[PDB]
């Protein structure tokens, strides 16, 4: 099982996405883990459509703006045959109608891999084997808002008072002998290590990064 993973550097993970002032991070927490796995089955990277699933899922429980959950989009891709291309379908950070293109599909996922709650273990085995894997943080504090180097323990975080979903790309060890998992935000480039945080590994699920982890199944 490898000391390090980073899949940037295997071609798995778009570039940093922007969610600006719209509550929509599980859309692009979805999108992540499926860039992965497409990427993955098929060789190609296709950047993925976040204001498909805040147009078009609203009856999988998705709120758009107002919030939704990895596992309920995933289910949407399956039910729906697909998600579109990011370059087709751009996301404008507002509720719209539903405007899915079949011709138009990036990726589709057949369901998902709800890893077992806590276990930080098999996060790690997931993101070592599968690759990128949708979680969900207590992301809520001053330090997360203004992280900006190294890596990121926030004694004061819920491992179960979960706000913000986000993908875990790999792991590893800082140079101060710290565990972390990389984590890649929807924040944009300006907020932490361009857009990503090394969150603390293997501290007893710090922010609760293994209480809700996810990955669709292709
Ligand atoms: C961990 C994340 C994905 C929770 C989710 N949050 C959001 O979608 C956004 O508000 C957060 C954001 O930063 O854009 C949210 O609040 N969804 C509402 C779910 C309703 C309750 N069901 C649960 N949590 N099982």
């Known amino acids: 099982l490898p000391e390090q993973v980073d899949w940037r550097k295997h071609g798995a993970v778009t570039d940093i996405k922007d969610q600006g002032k719209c ?62 291309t990011e370059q087709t379908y751009p996301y404008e950070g507002v509720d719209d109608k539903c405007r899915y293109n079949p011709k138009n599909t990036g990726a589709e996922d057949v369901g998902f891999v709800d890893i077992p709650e806590g276990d930080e273990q098999k996060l790690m085995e997931a993101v070592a084997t599968v690759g990128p894997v949708s979680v969900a943080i207590d992301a809520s504090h001053t330090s997360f808002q203004l992280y900006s180097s190294g890596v990121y323990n926030e004694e004061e975080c819920s491992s179960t008072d979960l706000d913000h979903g986000v993908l875990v790309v790999g792991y590893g060890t800082d140079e101060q002998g710290v565990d972390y998992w990389l984590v890649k935000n929807s924040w944009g480039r300006s907020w932490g290590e361009l857009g990503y945080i090394k969150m603390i590994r293997n501290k007893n699920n710090r922010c609760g990064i293994a209480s809700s982890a996810s990955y669709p199944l292709v």
């Open 23 to 84: 509550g929509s991070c599980w859309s692009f927490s979805t999108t992540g883990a499926l860039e992965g796995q497409h990427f993955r089955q098929s060789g190609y990277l296709v950047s993925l459509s976040e204001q498909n699933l805040i147009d078009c899922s609203e009856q999988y429980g998705n709120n758009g703006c107002n919030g939704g959950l990895m596992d309920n989009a995933f289910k949407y891709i399956k039910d729906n045959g697909g998600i579109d």
